[PDB]
Design a protein around this ligand. Structure first.
Ligand SMILES: Nc1ncnc2c1ncn2[C@@H]1O[C@H](COP(=O)(O)OP(=O)(O)OP(=O)(O)O)[C@@H](O)[C@H]1O
Ligand SMILES: Nc1ncnc2c1ncn2[C@@H]1O[C@H](COP(=O)(O)OP(=O)(O)O)[C@@H](O)[C@H]1O
Ligand SMILES: [K+]
Ligand SMILES: [K+]
Ligand SMILES: [Mg+2]
Ligand SMILES: [Mg+2]
Ligand SMILES: [Zn+2]
Lengths: 616, 624, 283
DNA sequence: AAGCAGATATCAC
DNA sequence: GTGATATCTGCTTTGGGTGGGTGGGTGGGTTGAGGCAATA
């Protein structure tokens, strides 16, 4: 029996030939026969996906292995290096069996473990975890470049191959041509700021990434790290401490961004089937709109605009000399206590890459990019701010009206040209910043005055206001029926979400919505082939006539391009590869309804009458 | 012996490739391309050739495969073959040319490039093709190819020791070869390098940054170190976009762990690229190009053709596109006998309403200008724009690093969001805009740099949108800065039914056309050619005003001054836009730019007439 | 070209993989994995690709294609070699000559485009042949884009007796297909893709009628007709006489200028009318 | 030049 | 003949910028100029 150890450690047990062969056979059988709840061969699909993409890593979910091979699951945390080597060999055998020509692409398959149940904090690691497989989490604070490390060394006659370990120089000049190398990366992982007690210095660890594990994470990332806790003698540590203390490091096996994030690649065939079937539904647009912050009583315009901003438009560059952004920026502005901050928090929770910041807590350089001073290396370096870090993501700005003016003017270039240009301290460069900006503001005096226009209510000027594709006015009006409905919804929300436990359509589950969004943003690129140019052109002229007469908001060419983005975003919501007439009509309605809301109360009736033909 | 035989056979094959390769057909003719190029370059005194990998593959596929997989040894063999062939093509040689020179063989290919991010360990010691941007270049230093060593005690010398190429050192003999008997033993490490016996070549080190479009989302761009030597040295400068062919290699320093080497990880090594060939990307003039440029300059409507080619995607702005063309070409810089200089560069300011394509125009000029830098006023500082003083990490001494206006010397610097710049930062640009120098007196450094660049600035008005009632309150800039701009455009987003319909149709068609496969336009010049045409004209033609054109300009300037003086008196407020001698010289520069477009040595009265019309629409309109 | 680009822009493989779809790309990836060709190698230009992969390329491609339901991957043809460099297959020369003749660069007239094509066939004008190869690459990409736009939007609608597809002026590349020869070739490629990618069995046995704008001044439209696409088709076309009989019965304004009788010029307003007659004539 | 690590020949018992 | 024990030989040291900033500033080096946040 494999479980029974005849007076050896687990390492010793798995080192000898008999148990080694038994483990190899068991793991190969697990790879070949494991099926899911429906009965589909999991690893047949996983290996096919790996080989189609020409990748070298096979990910194994610890729970499945424990369910099917409990003895191997028990062994794995105690003797990780040996078990992982055996798993690699068996995986290579299976892969070559399925794809006999794959040996040309790679000669090694890495088995990587996910969902390890033994989670530990950076602060909690003790000597009893040494040489064990552990799972921890934190913030990446420092990251090297990808470096070449000796793997199989040859010396100059030419000496025989020599293996290289992570802890000492090998003992036989090196022959560069005949030597074998590996990718090497060192990261520093730190306690997340939200988990360290206030006023306390955070703890940190070092981690080593090898081979195809490199570039799995970037500084500033929230990561879950599974690896081997390893110690090695260090003389200068001993000198420093006066005691024989050993240096520690994590030999990384699996790196994930695990704050509720699923990548397009991780989507399975059944997931895509469900997404496509959903997109076939006739009311899918309404269902997606209803999925935006379901615990808020209806603010249906805000939810629609936020859904459009989440899905996004299509960037274009006709001849390589005229760049047009595809992102849709949103500005919420209205009375206090109307759930603007809750909308922003929901967007932060649902998006894959989102950064939340507030009012006076944001500085100009902190938003875009800053110049870091150093005491010893090159004096000055360039470091990414919020907009750079949120590239291809979302930046949410709360208390947008309370910002310092100098700090608010720093986002103009990023909002339109989608780049940050820095000319400081010998650094002249431009960084990419393609992010959707969603801001929330309060009006002048803390209350929106219906007798005035939007421009009169806010202190923002034309240049910043024009950069927002969608403008939403949140009004808190006293109506007995609406007040009763809101009260009955909110109290029911507090009943439903006790810790013990308008569209007329059922919203999508949040996990389903997250999969749907990632698929549409990655696998759908709607194309604008045909459009009623005369209708859009006539509409634009009418809008510019009325805007000049009333002065409620400025209208620019940017308003034409916003409509095209909204039509593209609407088509993307339906998983359509070509924008159609109903997308253009919806984009027109969204823009005209927004414009009418910026008028004074008296003028609103006339404005609806002026544009009634479109709003029909 | 067997290895020697294999090497000799491979060298013979390379030699035969060089001797026999031909281009042409039996209908037209044939040319021994590489032999002829080697013969002509050697006669010119240029000891290098460039070899296409596709040609070598056509002659001998195995040779190309070997050169790709094991570049070092086979490149050395190819260079030896090139030296042999160079002797045969030029072998009877004139006096003072007896000694045969070494030939550097450059490599070029038509293959698709690969990115920095794609450079993996498995590609080590292989031939790679990499695109990027040059961000830094070192000084030219000396690298030994051959050394002679001598024994301290016995003066026994070993001569002509070959050196490895690249960033690789040499280990001296541990013990001497002199006779043990009679003499006291020679000391350990007896050998020293003889300074005058060493043969050296020029070498350089470069930093290559990844292309901006290749950077993964949310990441800082990565760079790589480049090693250049011989004729590859001093070919590229910071800002150049290049594609490099090279060897992915490792620094080979001393085997010993001297100073008790204590790396954070074990068995790590430093990578670099040994450069074998450089190709500068558009983003010397061949005679065919020069003839084509002369044809363009002679077109009767060349001015219209160039204007139509500037930001063709923008719907209107014909007068602003005409002024940008003049800025791109520039005037004539002059130095008077007393030593005082008159600048030839043209400065342009666009002040106006939001969403009027001001930023799009600046982005185009950055691509179109032969030398172009785009910056933001908000993201700039006084030291960043001109030049900075900082500590050197290696030397532990103060050094100087140039800013945007040093990097843009000889070209254009586009300053967007000019109004958001701090007053202390804006004021740092006054000297560079007029005197075209940067004076520094800091931390023991007293020097002057060149900043001969044109400023193209964009800004919004004080109240966001230009308000006709506020009048002079719309402009916040001081008179000192405004007088340094040749042309000032006040851009007002005028609402008209007819123009708005036309603009909307243009914008929609532009977005639909993004799918269309690119096609040429009969009446325009593509950006790549326009960029080369501008560079050609700036080097070839510096015009002057004709005596008749000067008289016309003098009389109109006097009228303009009186009108400006009268207008200020009537309004009782000194106008924000001044009309000074600088504005007279601005009209001279614009007239010379128009002539430079036509490659005409003298600016005519028509040139001055157009220059005065541009001034009227831009600066006089603002001032009144 | 690159093997990847060739696979994506060949109507045979592009139609059988349904590369206009989202699952077609995955099927292509599966095909390449079955081959064992690294993605980076197949995406590199064929000349620069490693020679070891070229040794048995034709046989391995044939075997993999056989596994994937394509039995006609191999064709009997000819190649010509001269010099050290110059090697061409016959179909490459055909495509280059066609692209030189039907070039969309209107700076030169069609008699000017004919002269270029005729010159390219002589070995003294080799540069023209290479230029034509580049133009052919552009034309193939445009053809695939147009086919994708037509198939994704369901623009191929079956009347009773025939399928009808009409190109609109909003189409991006429509200009490249205004000339009758380009339109005919596009229509044939489109029919092959449609027959490969459709579900209805009846629509697979139908011929195609395709229209594209010709002149926006006179309101004229070019109309082409092609017979059903089958593996053993006799390649015989009945649309010339059908067109002449429909126009006569309906009194439309049609022009026969092409040397083929199945290509006609029609007044756009008459179009609708014309078609009904055609329907009644063929059903 | 100064000093520790390693190698090795040499006296003594 | 084995166990000290005395002699001899080779390594590398120093802080240093031709030994790097793709080692790291928790391994250790004055002075000034230049970005930040908080400041007034
Ligand atoms: N006349 C025009 N023709 C074509 N596109 C235009 C025109 N005017 C504006 N646009 C487009 O509208 C958007 C205008 O943004 P842009 O940044 O160029 O404006 P700007 O005038 O610099 O504004 P701001 O002062 O607010 O920075 C861009 O997409 C630009 O391409
Ligand atoms: N329409 C609504 N439906 C449900 N809850 C609401 C609604 N409006 C406000 N709330 C609740 O009121 C609280 C305060 O809202 P808040 O996020 O501060 O809005 P704002 O930032 O606009 O003042 C939140 O906890 C939110 O749950
Ligand atoms: K140091
Ligand atoms: K050091
Ligand atoms: Mg709030
Ligand atoms: Mg702008
Ligand atoms: Zn000696």
């Amino acid at each position: 029996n494999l479980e029974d150890l005849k007076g050896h450690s687990v390492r010793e047990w798995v080192s000898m030939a008999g148990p080694r062969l038994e483990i190899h056979h068991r793991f190969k059988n697990f790879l070949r026969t494991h099926v899911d709840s429906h009965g589909h061969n999991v690893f047949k699909e996983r290996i096919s996906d790996m080989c189609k993409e020409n990748r070298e890593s096979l990910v194994v979910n610890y729970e499945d292995l424990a369910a099917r091979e409990h003895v191997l699951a028990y062994f794995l945390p105690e003797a990780p290096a040996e078990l992982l080597q055996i798993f690699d060999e068996a995986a290579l055998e299976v892969v070559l069996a399925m794809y006999p020509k794959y040996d040309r692409i790679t000669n090694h398959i890495h088995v990587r473990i996910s969902h390890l149940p033994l989670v530990e904090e950076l602060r909690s690691l003790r000597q009893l975890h040494l040489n064990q497989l552990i799972r921890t989490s934190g913030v990446v604070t420092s990251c090297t470049g990808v470096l070449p490390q000796l793997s199989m060394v040859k010396y100059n006659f030419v000496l025989g191959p020599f293996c290289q370990s992570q802890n000492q120089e090998v003992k036989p000049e090196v022959n560069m041509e005949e030597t074998i190398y590996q990718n090497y990366q060192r990261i520093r992982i730190q306690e997340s700021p939200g988990k360290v007690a206030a006023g306390r210095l955070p703890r940190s660890k070092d981690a080593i990434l090898l081979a195809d594990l490199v570039d799995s994470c970037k500084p500033g990332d929230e990561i879950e790290l599974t690896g081997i806790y390893h110690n090695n003698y260090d003389g200068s540590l001993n000198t420093a401490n006066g005691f024989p203390v050993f240096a520690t490091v994590i030999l990384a096996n699996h790196v994930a961004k695990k704050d509720n994030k699923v990548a397009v690649g991780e989507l399975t065939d059944e997931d895509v089937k469900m997404i496509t079937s959903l997109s076939k539904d006739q009311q899918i647009g309404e269902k997606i709109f209803a999925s935006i912050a379901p615990s808020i009583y209806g603010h249906e315009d805000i939810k629609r605009g936020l859904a459009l901003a989440l899905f996004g438009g299509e960037p274009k560059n006709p001849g390589g000399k005229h760049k047009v952004r595809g992102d849709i920026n949103v500005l919420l502005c209205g009375d206090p206590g109307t759930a603007k901050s809750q909308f922003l928090k929901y967007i932060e929770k649902v998006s894959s890459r989102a950064i939340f910041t507030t009012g006076q807590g944001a500085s100009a350089v902190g938003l875009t990019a800053y110049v870091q001073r150093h005491p010893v290396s090159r004096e000055w370096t360039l470091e990414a701010g919020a907009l750079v870090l949120a590239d291809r993501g979302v930046c949410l700005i709360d208390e947008f009206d309370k910002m310092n003016d100098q700090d608010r003017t720093s986002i103009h270039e990023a909002m339109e040209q989608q780049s940050i240009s820095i000319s400081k301290a010998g650094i002249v460069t431009s960084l990419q910043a393609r992010c959707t900006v969603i801001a929330a503001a309060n009006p002048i005096g803390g209350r929106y005055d219906p007798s005035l226009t939007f421009s009169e209510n806010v202190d923002l000027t034309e240049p910043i206001i024009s950069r927002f594709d969608i403008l939403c006015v949140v009004r808190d009006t006293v109506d007995p029926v609406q007040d009763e409905m809101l009260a009955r919804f909110v109290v029911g929300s507090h009943v439903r979400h006790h810790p013990s436990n308008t569209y007329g359509v059922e919203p999508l589950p949040q996990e389903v919505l997250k999969k749907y969004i990632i698929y549409a943003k990655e696998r759908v690129h709607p194309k604008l082939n045909q459009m009623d140019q005369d209708k859009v052109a006539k509409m634009y002229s009418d809008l510019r006539k009325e805007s000049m007469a009333t002065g409620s908001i400025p209208i620019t060419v940017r308003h034409i391009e916003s409509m095209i983005r909204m039509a593209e975003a609407h088509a993307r919501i339906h998983l359509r590869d070509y924008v159609i007439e109903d997308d253009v009509n919806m984009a027109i309605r969204v823009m005209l309804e927004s414009f009418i809301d910026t008028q004074k109360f008296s003028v609103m009736r006339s404005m609806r009458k002026t544009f009634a033909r479109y709003l029909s | 012996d067997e290895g020697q035989a294999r090497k000799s056979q491979l060298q013979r094959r390379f030699k035969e490739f060089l001797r026999q390769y031909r281009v042409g057909t039996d209908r037209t003719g044939f040319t021994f391309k590489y032999r002829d190029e080697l013969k002509r370059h050697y006669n010119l005194g240029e000891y290098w050739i460039e070899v296409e990998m596709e040609d070598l593959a056509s002659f001998d596929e195995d040779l190309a495969d070997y050169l790709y997989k094991q570049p070092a040894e086979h490149l050395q063999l190819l260079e030896e073959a090139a030296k042999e062939v160079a002797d045969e093509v030029t072998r009877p040689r004139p006096s003072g040319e007896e000694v045969l020179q070494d030939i550097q063989v450059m490599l070029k290919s038509d293959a698709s490039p690969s990115s920095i991010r794609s450079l993996k360990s498995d590609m080590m010691s292989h031939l790679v093709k990499i695109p990027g941007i040059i961000i830094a270049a070192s000084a030219v230093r000396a690298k030994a190819t051959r050394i002679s060593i001598q024994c301290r005690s016995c003066r026994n010398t070993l001569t002509n020791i070959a050196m490895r190429p690249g960033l690789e050192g040499y280990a001296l003999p541990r013990k001497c070869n002199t006779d043990q008997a009679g003499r006291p033993k020679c000391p350990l490490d007896p050998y020293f390098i003889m300074p005058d016996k060493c043969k050296c070549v020029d070498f350089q080190t470069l930093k290559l940054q990844e292309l901006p479009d290749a950077v993964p989302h949310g990441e800082m761009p990565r760079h790589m170190q480049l090693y250049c030597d011989r004729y590859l040295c001093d070919k590229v400068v910071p800002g150049n976009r290049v594609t490099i062919m090279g060897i992915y290699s490792i620094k080979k320093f001393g085997l010993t762990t001297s100073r008790g080497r204590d790396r954070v990880g074990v068995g790590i090594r430093s990578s670099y690229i040994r450069v074998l060939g450089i190709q500068v990307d558009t983003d010397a003039v061949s005679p065919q190009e020069e003839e084509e440029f002369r044809r363009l300059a002679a077109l009767p409507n060349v001015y219209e053709v160039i204007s139509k080619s500037i930001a063709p995607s923008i719907f209107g702005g014909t007068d602003m596109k005409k002024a940008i063309a003049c800025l791109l070409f520039g005037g004539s810089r002059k130095r008077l006998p007393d030593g005082l200089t008159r600048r030839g560069d043209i400065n342009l300011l666009m002040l106006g309403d939001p969403g009027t394509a001001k930023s799009q125009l600046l982005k185009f000029v950055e691509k179109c200008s032969p030398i172009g830098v785009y910056t933001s006023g908000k993201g700039s500082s006084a030291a960043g724009l001109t030049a900075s003083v900082m500590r050197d990490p290696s030397s532990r001494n103060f050094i100087m690093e140039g800013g945007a206006m040093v990097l843009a010397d000889g070209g254009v610097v586009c300053i967007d969001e000019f109004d958001k710049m701090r007053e202390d930062d804006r004021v740092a640009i006054h000297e560079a805009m007029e005197q075209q120098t940067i004076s520094i007196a800091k931390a023991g450094i007293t020097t002057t740099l060149n900043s001969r660049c044109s400023v193209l600035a964009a800004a919004n008005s004080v109240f966001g949108r230009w308000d006709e009632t506020k009048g002079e309150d719309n402009i916040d800039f001081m008179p000192t800065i405004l007088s340094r701009f040749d042309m000032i455009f006040i851009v007002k987003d005028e609402h008209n039914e007819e123009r708005d319909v036309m603009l909307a149709k243009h914008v929609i068609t532009l977005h639909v056309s993004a799918l269309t496969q690119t096609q040429a336009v009969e009446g325009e010049i593509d950006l790549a050619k326009l960029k080369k045409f501008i560079a050609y004209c700036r080097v070839k033609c510096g015009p002057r005003l004709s005596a008749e054109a000067a008289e016309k300009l003098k009389n109109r300037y006097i009228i303009m001054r009186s009108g400006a003086r009268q207008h200020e008196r009537d309004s009782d407020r000194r106008s924000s836009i001044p009309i000074t001698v600088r504005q007279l010289e601005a009209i001279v520069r614009i007239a010379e730019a128009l002539s430079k477009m036509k490659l005409q040595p003298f600016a005519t009265e028509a040139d001055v007439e157009e220059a005065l019309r541009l001034f009227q629409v831009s600066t006089l309109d603002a001032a009144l | 070209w690159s093997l990847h680009d060739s696979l994506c822009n060949t109507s045979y493989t592009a139609a059988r993989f349904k590369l206009w779809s989202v699952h077609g790309q995955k099927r292509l990836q599966e095909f390449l994995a079955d081959m064992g060709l690294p993605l980076k190698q197949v995406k590199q230009k064929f000349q620069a690709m490693d020679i070891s992969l070229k040794e048995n390329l034709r046989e391995m491609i044939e075997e993999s294609a056989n596994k994937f339901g394509m039995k006609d991957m191999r064709v009997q043809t000819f190649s010509i070699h001269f010099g050290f460099k110059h090697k061409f297959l016959a179909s490459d020369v055909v495509f280059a000559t066609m692209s030189l003749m039907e070039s969309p660069e209107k700076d030169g007239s069609g008699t000017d485009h004919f002269i270029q094509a005729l010159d390219s066939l002589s070995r003294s004008n080799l540069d023209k042949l290479y230029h034509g190869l580049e133009l052919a690459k552009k034309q193939l990409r445009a053809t695939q884009q147009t086919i994708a736009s037509c198939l994704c939007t369901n623009l191929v609608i079956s009347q009773g007796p025939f399928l009808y597809c009409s190109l609109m002026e909003g189409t991006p590349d429509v200009m490249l297909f205004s000339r009758p020869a380009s339109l005919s070739l596009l229509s044939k490629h489109l029919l092959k893709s449609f027959v490969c990618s459709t579900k209805n069995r009846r629509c697979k046995l139908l011929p195609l009628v395709m229209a594209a704008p010709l002149s926006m001044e006179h309101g004229t439209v070019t109309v082409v007709g092609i017979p059903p696409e089958t593996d053993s088709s006799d390649r015989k076309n009945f649309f010339g006489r059908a067109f002449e009989k429909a126009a006569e019965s309906t009194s439309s304004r049609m022009l026969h200028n092409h040397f083929d009788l199945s290509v006609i010029e029609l007044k756009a307003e008459d179009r609708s009318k014309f078609l009904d007659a055609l329907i009644s004539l063929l059903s």
